[PDB]
Amino acid sequence: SHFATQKDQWQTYTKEKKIKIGFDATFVPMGYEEKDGSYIGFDIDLANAVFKLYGIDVEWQAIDWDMKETELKNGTIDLIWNGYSVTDERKQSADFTEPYMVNEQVLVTKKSSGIDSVAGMAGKTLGAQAGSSGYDAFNASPKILKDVVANQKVVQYSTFTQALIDLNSGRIDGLLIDRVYANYYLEKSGVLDQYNVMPAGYEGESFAVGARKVDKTLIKKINQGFETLYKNGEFQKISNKWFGEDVATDQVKH
Amino acid sequence: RSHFATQKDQWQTYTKEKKIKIGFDATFVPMGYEEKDGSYIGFDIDLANAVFKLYGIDVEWQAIDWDMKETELKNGTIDLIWNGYSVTDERKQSADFTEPYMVNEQVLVTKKSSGIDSVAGMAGKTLGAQAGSSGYDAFNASPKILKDVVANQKVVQYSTFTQALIDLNSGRIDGLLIDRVYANYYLEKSGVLDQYNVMPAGYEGESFAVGARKVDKTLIKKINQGFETLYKNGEFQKISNKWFGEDVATDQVKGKREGHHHHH
C-alpha cells in the first residue's frame, strides 16, 4: 500500500515478524559496527530483547545519522534507536517512548583520592573532553563545578582514554564525562570499582526511542516491553553487561 | 553573486563557480604565510588545496588582518578561516567548525645524544624556552610539569628559536620547550628531526580546525570528508611529512569517531 507509513502498522510488524531500526554505526557503546562487521551495543541488545517478546526480529539498518528523521518519515526505517533523545525539534517528526536510560554528566575520581563528592572538588583540578556536553555544562552552570575547582577552569582532553591517563597518574583530580562513556570504558577494563563515578549535577539527556507519530501502538508496546524485561531481570542483565550498573529509569522500573 | 549569499549554504555555488576564498594570517609560519618571493605557502595551504582539489574547486587565498577574521567571514569577504584556527566559545558565536585535523602543544626537545628520552628525565637539567611564548607561560602556570624538576626551577629565555637550538646543539642547555608546530617544522626543514627526541610536554594543547559561516553546513561536512579521503589515499600523510616530518593526523582525520559523540 502507498500509505502504509501513514497508518498504525503494529499488526504489520507482528504479522511480518520484523521491524526496521536505524542507527549510527559508529556510536559506541549504544549501537555500532565491530571490526568483524557485527552490530553490537546496549541498544542492540535492549531492542532485540524487547521485540523478541513479540516474536519480532529486528532488521538493523546503519544509516546516515543526519537523515534519521527523513528515513523514519519515508518508511526507510520504523524506529530511531541509538542513544536517541527527545528534542522539541525532533518531536516535529516523531513520537517517543518513555526514556529508558539517563546519560548524565558524571564526575570520576580515584577511590584513593578521597574525593567522594562533587563539593569535594573544591580547589582541585578538573579535566574534561574537548567540545563535549560536559565542557558546555561546566560553563553553563558555573555554581556546580566552575566556582569550585582550581583556576575556575577545566583541562580539555581529546579522548576519555587520554583523560584517564592523567586521572590515574594524578595530573588531574577529577574527570567530568558522559555516564555512557565512564561506565562503559571503566567496566570494560574491569576497574570501575577503583573509581568514584558520581552524577555531577547537570541535567542529563535521557535516551528514548523515536517512531512515526502514527505508530501509537508500537510506542506503547516498546514501553511495556521495557517493564516486562525489567521484571524478568533481562534489562538488568543487559545493563550490567554494558555499564556494570543498572541504568534503568524510574519509568522502566593564534 | 547573491546579496544574501552569506545567508545560505553555498556548497552549490562553490562547486559551480569552482572557487572558494580562504582567509589567513600572512605571518603565521608554518601554517600559511607569505614568503620572501611573495608566494603563499604552508601546511594549511597545502592541506586546504588538497581537500578542494578533490572537488575540483580552486582556492583563492586571501591574506587578511587576522583580528578581522570573524568579521571577514560573516561579511562574506572570505568563506573560511583556515590558518591554525581553533574552537573557542567566542568563535563559536561567529562560526561552525570542522573536526580538528591536528593538535598543537608544547613539546620538550632534546638531542637524542643527551639520553634524555622523557620529560621526567629533565630532573636537574637546564631548560630553555622562547621569550614571550605560550610555553614560557605554561612552564610557570603548571610548575609540577617541569618547573619543579628542572635545574634552578627556571627557564633560560631565548629571543629566537635559532639561538635556542644553537645552545641545545652545543650542550649549553639540555632541553627546549616550544610549540610542536615550530619544533617539527624547523627540525624537519633542517633535515635533522631524527637526531632529536620531540616529546609532548604535558601542558594542555589546542586543536586546529577550520571555521566557516554557520549556514555552510555542507561545506563543513565536505571538508571533514576531504580530510578522511586524503588520509585514506595517503596524501594527508605526504603533506604532514613534508612540513613536520611526522604524521599529525588526529583520530578524527583517521576516521576513528569512537568516543567523540556528544548528546547527539
Side-chain angles (χ1 to χ4, degrees), chain B residues 33-67:
Chain B
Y33 57 97
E34 166 166 33
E35 247 306 322
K36 175 64 172 58
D37 57 37
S39 64
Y40 295 154
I41 59 169
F43 175 74
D44 279 332
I45 295 185
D46 280 356
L47 183 56
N49 282 346
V51 164
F52 288 107
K53 185 181 185 177
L54 296 173
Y55 301 107
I57 293 168
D58 289 304
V59 183
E60 169 78 69
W61 286 100
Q62 182 67 61
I64 64 174
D65 178 311
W66 196 237
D67 299 315

PDB file of all heavy atoms in Angstrom, chain B residues 33-67:
ATOM      1  N   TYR B  33      51.741  31.321   5.162  1.00  0.00           N
ATOM      2  CA  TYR B  33      52.453  32.578   5.221  1.00  0.00           C
ATOM      3  C   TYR B  33      53.008  33.022   3.880  1.00  0.00           C
ATOM      4  O   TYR B  33      53.100  32.244   2.931  1.00  0.00           O
ATOM      5  CB  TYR B  33      53.586  32.472   6.252  1.00  0.00           C
ATOM      6  CG  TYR B  33      54.567  31.341   5.987  1.00  0.00           C
ATOM      7  CD1 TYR B  33      55.770  31.573   5.319  1.00  0.00           C
ATOM      8  CD2 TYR B  33      54.288  30.035   6.402  1.00  0.00           C
ATOM      9  CE1 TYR B  33      56.673  30.534   5.077  1.00  0.00           C
ATOM     10  CE2 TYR B  33      55.182  28.993   6.162  1.00  0.00           C
ATOM     11  CZ  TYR B  33      56.370  29.248   5.503  1.00  0.00           C
ATOM     12  OH  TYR B  33      57.256  28.221   5.273  1.00  0.00           O
ATOM     13  N   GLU B  34      53.369  34.297   3.813  1.00  0.00           N
ATOM     14  CA  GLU B  34      53.929  34.858   2.599  1.00  0.00           C
ATOM     15  C   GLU B  34      55.448  34.751   2.673  1.00  0.00           C
ATOM     16  O   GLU B  34      56.061  35.169   3.653  1.00  0.00           O
ATOM     17  CB  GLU B  34      53.495  36.317   2.448  1.00  0.00           C
ATOM     18  CG  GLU B  34      54.286  37.076   1.407  1.00  0.00           C
ATOM     19  CD  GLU B  34      53.641  38.382   1.018  1.00  0.00           C
ATOM     20  OE1 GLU B  34      52.997  39.010   1.886  1.00  0.00           O
ATOM     21  OE2 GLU B  34      53.789  38.782  -0.156  1.00  0.00           O
ATOM     22  N   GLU B  35      56.048  34.168   1.641  1.00  0.00           N
ATOM     23  CA  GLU B  35      57.494  34.009   1.591  1.00  0.00           C
ATOM     24  C   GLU B  35      58.136  35.280   1.073  1.00  0.00           C
ATOM     25  O   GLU B  35      57.451  36.232   0.700  1.00  0.00           O
ATOM     26  CB  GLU B  35      57.875  32.857   0.664  1.00  0.00           C
ATOM     27  CG  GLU B  35      58.507  31.653   1.348  1.00  0.00           C
ATOM     28  CD  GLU B  35      59.721  32.008   2.197  1.00  0.00           C
ATOM     29  OE1 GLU B  35      60.515  32.886   1.784  1.00  0.00           O
ATOM     30  OE2 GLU B  35      59.886  31.393   3.273  1.00  0.00           O
ATOM     31  N   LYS B  36      59.464  35.282   1.042  1.00  0.00           N
ATOM     32  CA  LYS B  36      60.219  36.427   0.555  1.00  0.00           C
ATOM     33  C   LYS B  36      59.791  36.756  -0.873  1.00  0.00           C
ATOM     34  O   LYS B  36      59.507  37.911  -1.194  1.00  0.00           O
ATOM     35  CB  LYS B  36      61.716  36.114   0.595  1.00  0.00           C
ATOM     36  CG  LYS B  36      62.614  37.192   0.001  1.00  0.00           C
ATOM     37  CD  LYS B  36      62.537  38.498   0.784  1.00  0.00           C
ATOM     38  CE  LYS B  36      63.583  39.503   0.300  1.00  0.00           C
ATOM     39  NZ  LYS B  36      63.452  39.824  -1.153  1.00  0.00           N
ATOM     40  N   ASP B  37      59.728  35.727  -1.718  1.00  0.00           N
ATOM     41  CA  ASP B  37      59.351  35.902  -3.116  1.00  0.00           C
ATOM     42  C   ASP B  37      57.896  36.292  -3.338  1.00  0.00           C
ATOM     43  O   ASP B  37      57.475  36.472  -4.478  1.00  0.00           O
ATOM     44  CB  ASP B  37      59.650  34.635  -3.916  1.00  0.00           C
ATOM     45  CG  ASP B  37      58.954  33.413  -3.357  1.00  0.00           C
ATOM     46  OD1 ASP B  37      57.802  33.538  -2.883  1.00  0.00           O
ATOM     47  OD2 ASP B  37      59.561  32.323  -3.405  1.00  0.00           O
ATOM     48  N   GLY B  38      57.128  36.404  -2.258  1.00  0.00           N
ATOM     49  CA  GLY B  38      55.735  36.791  -2.393  1.00  0.00           C
ATOM     50  C   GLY B  38      54.709  35.671  -2.463  1.00  0.00           C
ATOM     51  O   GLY B  38      53.510  35.928  -2.406  1.00  0.00           O
ATOM     52  N   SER B  39      55.162  34.431  -2.591  1.00  0.00           N
ATOM     53  CA  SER B  39      54.239  33.304  -2.656  1.00  0.00           C
ATOM     54  C   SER B  39      53.628  32.999  -1.288  1.00  0.00           C
ATOM     55  O   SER B  39      54.165  33.407  -0.261  1.00  0.00           O
ATOM     56  CB  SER B  39      54.971  32.062  -3.163  1.00  0.00           C
ATOM     57  OG  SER B  39      55.978  31.661  -2.247  1.00  0.00           O
ATOM     58  N   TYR B  40      52.493  32.301  -1.282  1.00  0.00           N
ATOM     59  CA  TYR B  40      51.836  31.898  -0.040  1.00  0.00           C
ATOM     60  C   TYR B  40      52.044  30.398   0.077  1.00  0.00           C
ATOM     61  O   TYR B  40      51.675  29.646  -0.823  1.00  0.00           O
ATOM     62  CB  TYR B  40      50.334  32.171  -0.067  1.00  0.00           C
ATOM     63  CG  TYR B  40      49.938  33.624  -0.143  1.00  0.00           C
ATOM     64  CD1 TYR B  40      48.717  33.992  -0.697  1.00  0.00           C
ATOM     65  CD2 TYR B  40      50.760  34.630   0.369  1.00  0.00           C
ATOM     66  CE1 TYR B  40      48.313  35.318  -0.741  1.00  0.00           C
ATOM     67  CE2 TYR B  40      50.370  35.972   0.322  1.00  0.00           C
ATOM     68  CZ  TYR B  40      49.141  36.301  -0.233  1.00  0.00           C
ATOM     69  OH  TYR B  40      48.716  37.605  -0.274  1.00  0.00           O
ATOM     70  N   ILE B  41      52.627  29.963   1.187  1.00  0.00           N
ATOM     71  CA  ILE B  41      52.897  28.551   1.392  1.00  0.00           C
ATOM     72  C   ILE B  41      52.632  28.157   2.836  1.00  0.00           C
ATOM     73  O   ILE B  41      52.507  29.012   3.702  1.00  0.00           O
ATOM     74  CB  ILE B  41      54.371  28.211   1.074  1.00  0.00           C
ATOM     75  CG1 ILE B  41      55.294  29.041   1.976  1.00  0.00           C
ATOM     76  CG2 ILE B  41      54.680  28.486  -0.404  1.00  0.00           C
ATOM     77  CD1 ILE B  41      56.733  28.612   1.932  1.00  0.00           C
ATOM     78  N   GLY B  42      52.543  26.857   3.097  1.00  0.00           N
ATOM     79  CA  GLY B  42      52.321  26.432   4.467  1.00  0.00           C
ATOM     80  C   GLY B  42      51.578  25.119   4.550  1.00  0.00           C
ATOM     81  O   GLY B  42      51.033  24.651   3.551  1.00  0.00           O
ATOM     82  N   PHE B  43      51.560  24.522   5.734  1.00  0.00           N
ATOM     83  CA  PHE B  43      50.862  23.257   5.914  1.00  0.00           C
ATOM     84  C   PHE B  43      49.384  23.401   5.565  1.00  0.00           C
ATOM     85  O   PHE B  43      48.837  22.592   4.820  1.00  0.00           O
ATOM     86  CB  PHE B  43      50.978  22.762   7.361  1.00  0.00           C
ATOM     87  CG  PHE B  43      50.176  21.518   7.632  1.00  0.00           C
ATOM     88  CD1 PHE B  43      50.605  20.284   7.156  1.00  0.00           C
ATOM     89  CD2 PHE B  43      48.977  21.582   8.347  1.00  0.00           C
ATOM     90  CE1 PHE B  43      49.855  19.128   7.387  1.00  0.00           C
ATOM     91  CE2 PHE B  43      48.212  20.421   8.583  1.00  0.00           C
ATOM     92  CZ  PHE B  43      48.658  19.195   8.100  1.00  0.00           C
ATOM     93  N   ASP B  44      48.740  24.426   6.114  1.00  0.00           N
ATOM     94  CA  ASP B  44      47.321  24.646   5.868  1.00  0.00           C
ATOM     95  C   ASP B  44      47.023  24.930   4.401  1.00  0.00           C
ATOM     96  O   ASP B  44      45.998  24.502   3.882  1.00  0.00           O
ATOM     97  CB  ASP B  44      46.781  25.782   6.748  1.00  0.00           C
ATOM     98  CG  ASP B  44      46.469  25.324   8.148  1.00  0.00           C
ATOM     99  OD1 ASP B  44      46.145  24.127   8.317  1.00  0.00           O
ATOM    100  OD2 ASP B  44      46.529  26.157   9.082  1.00  0.00           O
ATOM    101  N   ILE B  45      47.922  25.639   3.731  1.00  0.00           N
ATOM    102  CA  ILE B  45      47.724  25.938   2.330  1.00  0.00           C
ATOM    103  C   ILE B  45      47.787  24.623   1.552  1.00  0.00           C
ATOM    104  O   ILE B  45      46.921  24.346   0.723  1.00  0.00           O
ATOM    105  CB  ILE B  45      48.781  26.972   1.842  1.00  0.00           C
ATOM    106  CG1 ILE B  45      48.532  28.296   2.583  1.00  0.00           C
ATOM    107  CG2 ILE B  45      48.687  27.180   0.333  1.00  0.00           C
ATOM    108  CD1 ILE B  45      49.410  29.460   2.144  1.00  0.00           C
ATOM    109  N   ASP B  46      48.788  23.792   1.826  1.00  0.00           N
ATOM    110  CA  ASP B  46      48.850  22.521   1.121  1.00  0.00           C
ATOM    111  C   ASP B  46      47.644  21.656   1.445  1.00  0.00           C
ATOM    112  O   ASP B  46      47.067  21.037   0.550  1.00  0.00           O
ATOM    113  CB  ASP B  46      50.130  21.746   1.460  1.00  0.00           C
ATOM    114  CG  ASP B  46      51.331  22.253   0.678  1.00  0.00           C
ATOM    115  OD1 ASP B  46      51.152  23.152  -0.175  1.00  0.00           O
ATOM    116  OD2 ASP B  46      52.441  21.752   0.911  1.00  0.00           O
ATOM    117  N   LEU B  47      47.262  21.612   2.720  1.00  0.00           N
ATOM    118  CA  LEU B  47      46.136  20.787   3.141  1.00  0.00           C
ATOM    119  C   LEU B  47      44.825  21.215   2.494  1.00  0.00           C
ATOM    120  O   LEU B  47      44.117  20.392   1.924  1.00  0.00           O
ATOM    121  CB  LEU B  47      45.983  20.802   4.674  1.00  0.00           C
ATOM    122  CG  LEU B  47      44.844  19.870   5.145  1.00  0.00           C
ATOM    123  CD1 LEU B  47      45.095  18.450   4.616  1.00  0.00           C
ATOM    124  CD2 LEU B  47      44.771  19.848   6.681  1.00  0.00           C
ATOM    125  N   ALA B  48      44.514  22.506   2.584  1.00  0.00           N
ATOM    126  CA  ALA B  48      43.289  23.048   2.006  1.00  0.00           C
ATOM    127  C   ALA B  48      43.260  22.888   0.491  1.00  0.00           C
ATOM    128  O   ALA B  48      42.217  22.573  -0.082  1.00  0.00           O
ATOM    129  CB  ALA B  48      43.129  24.528   2.383  1.00  0.00           C
ATOM    130  N   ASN B  49      44.392  23.123  -0.165  1.00  0.00           N
ATOM    131  CA  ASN B  49      44.447  22.978  -1.610  1.00  0.00           C
ATOM    132  C   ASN B  49      44.130  21.539  -1.985  1.00  0.00           C
ATOM    133  O   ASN B  49      43.395  21.279  -2.941  1.00  0.00           O
ATOM    134  CB  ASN B  49      45.833  23.337  -2.154  1.00  0.00           C
ATOM    135  CG  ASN B  49      46.061  24.839  -2.243  1.00  0.00           C
ATOM    136  OD1 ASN B  49      45.121  25.638  -2.144  1.00  0.00           O
ATOM    137  ND2 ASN B  49      47.314  25.228  -2.450  1.00  0.00           N
ATOM    138  N   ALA B  50      44.682  20.605  -1.215  1.00  0.00           N
ATOM    139  CA  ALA B  50      44.479  19.183  -1.479  1.00  0.00           C
ATOM    140  C   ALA B  50      43.024  18.773  -1.289  1.00  0.00           C
ATOM    141  O   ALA B  50      42.490  17.997  -2.075  1.00  0.00           O
ATOM    142  CB  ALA B  50      45.375  18.356  -0.578  1.00  0.00           C
ATOM    143  N   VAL B  51      42.398  19.288  -0.234  1.00  0.00           N
ATOM    144  CA  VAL B  51      40.999  18.980   0.042  1.00  0.00           C
ATOM    145  C   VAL B  51      40.110  19.497  -1.085  1.00  0.00           C
ATOM    146  O   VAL B  51      39.251  18.779  -1.594  1.00  0.00           O
ATOM    147  CB  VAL B  51      40.537  19.620   1.380  1.00  0.00           C
ATOM    148  CG1 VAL B  51      39.010  19.632   1.467  1.00  0.00           C
ATOM    149  CG2 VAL B  51      41.108  18.839   2.560  1.00  0.00           C
ATOM    150  N   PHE B  52      40.329  20.735  -1.508  1.00  0.00           N
ATOM    151  CA  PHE B  52      39.463  21.265  -2.550  1.00  0.00           C
ATOM    152  C   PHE B  52      39.760  20.749  -3.941  1.00  0.00           C
ATOM    153  O   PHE B  52      38.888  20.763  -4.812  1.00  0.00           O
ATOM    154  CB  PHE B  52      39.437  22.784  -2.458  1.00  0.00           C
ATOM    155  CG  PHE B  52      38.671  23.262  -1.259  1.00  0.00           C
ATOM    156  CD1 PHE B  52      39.327  23.790  -0.157  1.00  0.00           C
ATOM    157  CD2 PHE B  52      37.293  23.068  -1.189  1.00  0.00           C
ATOM    158  CE1 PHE B  52      38.629  24.112   1.007  1.00  0.00           C
ATOM    159  CE2 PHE B  52      36.584  23.385  -0.028  1.00  0.00           C
ATOM    160  CZ  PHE B  52      37.250  23.905   1.071  1.00  0.00           C
ATOM    161  N   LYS B  53      40.967  20.232  -4.141  1.00  0.00           N
ATOM    162  CA  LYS B  53      41.312  19.665  -5.435  1.00  0.00           C
ATOM    163  C   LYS B  53      40.431  18.434  -5.650  1.00  0.00           C
ATOM    164  O   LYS B  53      40.106  18.076  -6.782  1.00  0.00           O
ATOM    165  CB  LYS B  53      42.782  19.268  -5.462  1.00  0.00           C
ATOM    166  CG  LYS B  53      43.281  18.769  -6.816  1.00  0.00           C
ATOM    167  CD  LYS B  53      44.753  18.377  -6.726  1.00  0.00           C
ATOM    168  CE  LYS B  53      45.324  17.996  -8.081  1.00  0.00           C
ATOM    169  NZ  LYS B  53      46.784  17.678  -7.992  1.00  0.00           N
ATOM    170  N   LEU B  54      40.045  17.786  -4.553  1.00  0.00           N
ATOM    171  CA  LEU B  54      39.189  16.598  -4.623  1.00  0.00           C
ATOM    172  C   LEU B  54      37.848  16.919  -5.255  1.00  0.00           C
ATOM    173  O   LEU B  54      37.224  16.071  -5.887  1.00  0.00           O
ATOM    174  CB  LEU B  54      38.904  16.063  -3.227  1.00  0.00           C
ATOM    175  CG  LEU B  54      40.091  15.548  -2.425  1.00  0.00           C
ATOM    176  CD1 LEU B  54      39.637  15.230  -0.992  1.00  0.00           C
ATOM    177  CD2 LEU B  54      40.651  14.326  -3.116  1.00  0.00           C
ATOM    178  N   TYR B  55      37.404  18.152  -5.048  1.00  0.00           N
ATOM    179  CA  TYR B  55      36.111  18.595  -5.540  1.00  0.00           C
ATOM    180  C   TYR B  55      36.192  19.477  -6.769  1.00  0.00           C
ATOM    181  O   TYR B  55      35.170  19.980  -7.240  1.00  0.00           O
ATOM    182  CB  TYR B  55      35.378  19.335  -4.421  1.00  0.00           C
ATOM    183  CG  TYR B  55      35.164  18.491  -3.178  1.00  0.00           C
ATOM    184  CD1 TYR B  55      35.910  18.716  -2.018  1.00  0.00           C
ATOM    185  CD2 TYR B  55      34.214  17.467  -3.162  1.00  0.00           C
ATOM    186  CE1 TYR B  55      35.711  17.938  -0.868  1.00  0.00           C
ATOM    187  CE2 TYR B  55      34.007  16.686  -2.018  1.00  0.00           C
ATOM    188  CZ  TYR B  55      34.754  16.926  -0.878  1.00  0.00           C
ATOM    189  OH  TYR B  55      34.540  16.180   0.261  1.00  0.00           O
ATOM    190  N   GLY B  56      37.399  19.653  -7.293  1.00  0.00           N
ATOM    191  CA  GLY B  56      37.571  20.490  -8.467  1.00  0.00           C
ATOM    192  C   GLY B  56      37.289  21.947  -8.144  1.00  0.00           C
ATOM    193  O   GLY B  56      36.748  22.686  -8.967  1.00  0.00           O
ATOM    194  N   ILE B  57      37.641  22.361  -6.932  1.00  0.00           N
ATOM    195  CA  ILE B  57      37.428  23.740  -6.512  1.00  0.00           C
ATOM    196  C   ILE B  57      38.772  24.412  -6.303  1.00  0.00           C
ATOM    197  O   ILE B  57      39.611  23.908  -5.555  1.00  0.00           O
ATOM    198  CB  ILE B  57      36.622  23.805  -5.195  1.00  0.00           C
ATOM    199  CG1 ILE B  57      35.193  23.302  -5.441  1.00  0.00           C
ATOM    200  CG2 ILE B  57      36.622  25.232  -4.650  1.00  0.00           C
ATOM    201  CD1 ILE B  57      34.398  23.062  -4.178  1.00  0.00           C
ATOM    202  N   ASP B  58      38.972  25.533  -6.993  1.00  0.00           N
ATOM    203  CA  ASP B  58      40.201  26.307  -6.876  1.00  0.00           C
ATOM    204  C   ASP B  58      40.082  27.179  -5.631  1.00  0.00           C
ATOM    205  O   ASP B  58      38.998  27.679  -5.308  1.00  0.00           O
ATOM    206  CB  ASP B  58      40.399  27.196  -8.108  1.00  0.00           C
ATOM    207  CG  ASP B  58      40.758  26.406  -9.353  1.00  0.00           C
ATOM    208  OD1 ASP B  58      41.757  25.661  -9.315  1.00  0.00           O
ATOM    209  OD2 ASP B  58      40.045  26.533 -10.372  1.00  0.00           O
ATOM    210  N   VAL B  59      41.197  27.342  -4.929  1.00  0.00           N
ATOM    211  CA  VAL B  59      41.222  28.135  -3.714  1.00  0.00           C
ATOM    212  C   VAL B  59      41.843  29.510  -3.936  1.00  0.00           C
ATOM    213  O   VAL B  59      42.941  29.637  -4.491  1.00  0.00           O
ATOM    214  CB  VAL B  59      42.013  27.414  -2.599  1.00  0.00           C
ATOM    215  CG1 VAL B  59      41.958  28.228  -1.299  1.00  0.00           C
ATOM    216  CG2 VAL B  59      41.434  26.021  -2.379  1.00  0.00           C
ATOM    217  N   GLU B  60      41.111  30.536  -3.522  1.00  0.00           N
ATOM    218  CA  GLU B  60      41.583  31.912  -3.613  1.00  0.00           C
ATOM    219  C   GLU B  60      42.092  32.243  -2.218  1.00  0.00           C
ATOM    220  O   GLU B  60      41.302  32.391  -1.291  1.00  0.00           O
ATOM    221  CB  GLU B  60      40.429  32.853  -3.975  1.00  0.00           C
ATOM    222  CG  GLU B  60      40.770  34.324  -3.837  1.00  0.00           C
ATOM    223  CD  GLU B  60      41.593  34.848  -4.990  1.00  0.00           C
ATOM    224  OE1 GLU B  60      41.043  34.939  -6.112  1.00  0.00           O
ATOM    225  OE2 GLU B  60      42.786  35.169  -4.779  1.00  0.00           O
ATOM    226  N   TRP B  61      43.407  32.340  -2.064  1.00  0.00           N
ATOM    227  CA  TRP B  61      43.988  32.639  -0.765  1.00  0.00           C
ATOM    228  C   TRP B  61      44.054  34.141  -0.509  1.00  0.00           C
ATOM    229  O   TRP B  61      44.674  34.885  -1.260  1.00  0.00           O
ATOM    230  CB  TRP B  61      45.377  32.007  -0.662  1.00  0.00           C
ATOM    231  CG  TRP B  61      45.307  30.503  -0.483  1.00  0.00           C
ATOM    232  CD1 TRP B  61      45.478  29.540  -1.441  1.00  0.00           C
ATOM    233  CD2 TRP B  61      45.014  29.808   0.735  1.00  0.00           C
ATOM    234  NE1 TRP B  61      45.315  28.282  -0.887  1.00  0.00           N
ATOM    235  CE2 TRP B  61      45.029  28.422   0.445  1.00  0.00           C
ATOM    236  CE3 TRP B  61      44.737  30.222   2.043  1.00  0.00           C
ATOM    237  CZ2 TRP B  61      44.776  27.452   1.421  1.00  0.00           C
ATOM    238  CZ3 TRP B  61      44.484  29.253   3.015  1.00  0.00           C
ATOM    239  CH2 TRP B  61      44.507  27.883   2.694  1.00  0.00           C
ATOM    240  N   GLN B  62      43.409  34.568   0.566  1.00  0.00           N
ATOM    241  CA  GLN B  62      43.354  35.977   0.915  1.00  0.00           C
ATOM    242  C   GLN B  62      44.048  36.299   2.235  1.00  0.00           C
ATOM    243  O   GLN B  62      43.596  35.889   3.297  1.00  0.00           O
ATOM    244  CB  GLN B  62      41.892  36.415   0.983  1.00  0.00           C
ATOM    245  CG  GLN B  62      41.683  37.885   1.291  1.00  0.00           C
ATOM    246  CD  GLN B  62      42.160  38.774   0.170  1.00  0.00           C
ATOM    247  OE1 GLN B  62      41.662  38.698  -0.956  1.00  0.00           O
ATOM    248  NE2 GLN B  62      43.135  39.624   0.467  1.00  0.00           N
ATOM    249  N   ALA B  63      45.155  37.028   2.168  1.00  0.00           N
ATOM    250  CA  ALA B  63      45.851  37.417   3.392  1.00  0.00           C
ATOM    251  C   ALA B  63      44.934  38.452   4.035  1.00  0.00           C
ATOM    252  O   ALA B  63      44.495  39.382   3.367  1.00  0.00           O
ATOM    253  CB  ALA B  63      47.216  38.034   3.059  1.00  0.00           C
ATOM    254  N   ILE B  64      44.632  38.295   5.319  1.00  0.00           N
ATOM    255  CA  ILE B  64      43.739  39.234   5.987  1.00  0.00           C
ATOM    256  C   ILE B  64      44.308  39.792   7.286  1.00  0.00           C
ATOM    257  O   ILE B  64      45.314  39.307   7.795  1.00  0.00           O
ATOM    258  CB  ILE B  64      42.400  38.568   6.351  1.00  0.00           C
ATOM    259  CG1 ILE B  64      42.649  37.439   7.364  1.00  0.00           C
ATOM    260  CG2 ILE B  64      41.721  38.028   5.101  1.00  0.00           C
ATOM    261  CD1 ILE B  64      41.384  36.787   7.905  1.00  0.00           C
ATOM    262  N   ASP B  65      43.670  40.839   7.799  1.00  0.00           N
ATOM    263  CA  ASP B  65      44.071  41.400   9.081  1.00  0.00           C
ATOM    264  C   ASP B  65      43.462  40.333   9.989  1.00  0.00           C
ATOM    265  O   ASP B  65      42.240  40.215  10.068  1.00  0.00           O
ATOM    266  CB  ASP B  65      43.390  42.754   9.320  1.00  0.00           C
ATOM    267  CG  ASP B  65      43.748  43.357  10.668  1.00  0.00           C
ATOM    268  OD1 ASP B  65      43.652  42.633  11.685  1.00  0.00           O
ATOM    269  OD2 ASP B  65      44.117  44.557  10.710  1.00  0.00           O
ATOM    270  N   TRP B  66      44.304  39.544  10.649  1.00  0.00           N
ATOM    271  CA  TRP B  66      43.819  38.452  11.497  1.00  0.00           C
ATOM    272  C   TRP B  66      42.745  38.845  12.512  1.00  0.00           C
ATOM    273  O   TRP B  66      41.797  38.093  12.741  1.00  0.00           O
ATOM    274  CB  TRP B  66      45.002  37.780  12.211  1.00  0.00           C
ATOM    275  CG  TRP B  66      44.685  36.419  12.805  1.00  0.00           C
ATOM    276  CD1 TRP B  66      44.822  36.049  14.110  1.00  0.00           C
ATOM    277  CD2 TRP B  66      44.206  35.257  12.108  1.00  0.00           C
ATOM    278  NE1 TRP B  66      44.457  34.733  14.273  1.00  0.00           N
ATOM    279  CE2 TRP B  66      44.073  34.223  13.062  1.00  0.00           C
ATOM    280  CE3 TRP B  66      43.874  34.990  10.774  1.00  0.00           C
ATOM    281  CZ2 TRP B  66      43.620  32.935  12.725  1.00  0.00           C
ATOM    282  CZ3 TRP B  66      43.420  33.705  10.437  1.00  0.00           C
ATOM    283  CH2 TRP B  66      43.300  32.697  11.414  1.00  0.00           C
ATOM    284  N   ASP B  67      42.881  40.020  13.120  1.00  0.00           N
ATOM    285  CA  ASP B  67      41.895  40.464  14.104  1.00  0.00           C
ATOM    286  C   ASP B  67      40.505  40.568  13.496  1.00  0.00           C
ATOM    287  O   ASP B  67      39.497  40.451  14.194  1.00  0.00           O
ATOM    288  CB  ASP B  67      42.285  41.828  14.683  1.00  0.00           C
ATOM    289  CG  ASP B  67      43.618  41.798  15.398  1.00  0.00           C
ATOM    290  OD1 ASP B  67      43.842  40.850  16.183  1.00  0.00           O
ATOM    291  OD2 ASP B  67      44.436  42.724  15.184  1.00  0.00           O
TER     292      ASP B  67
END
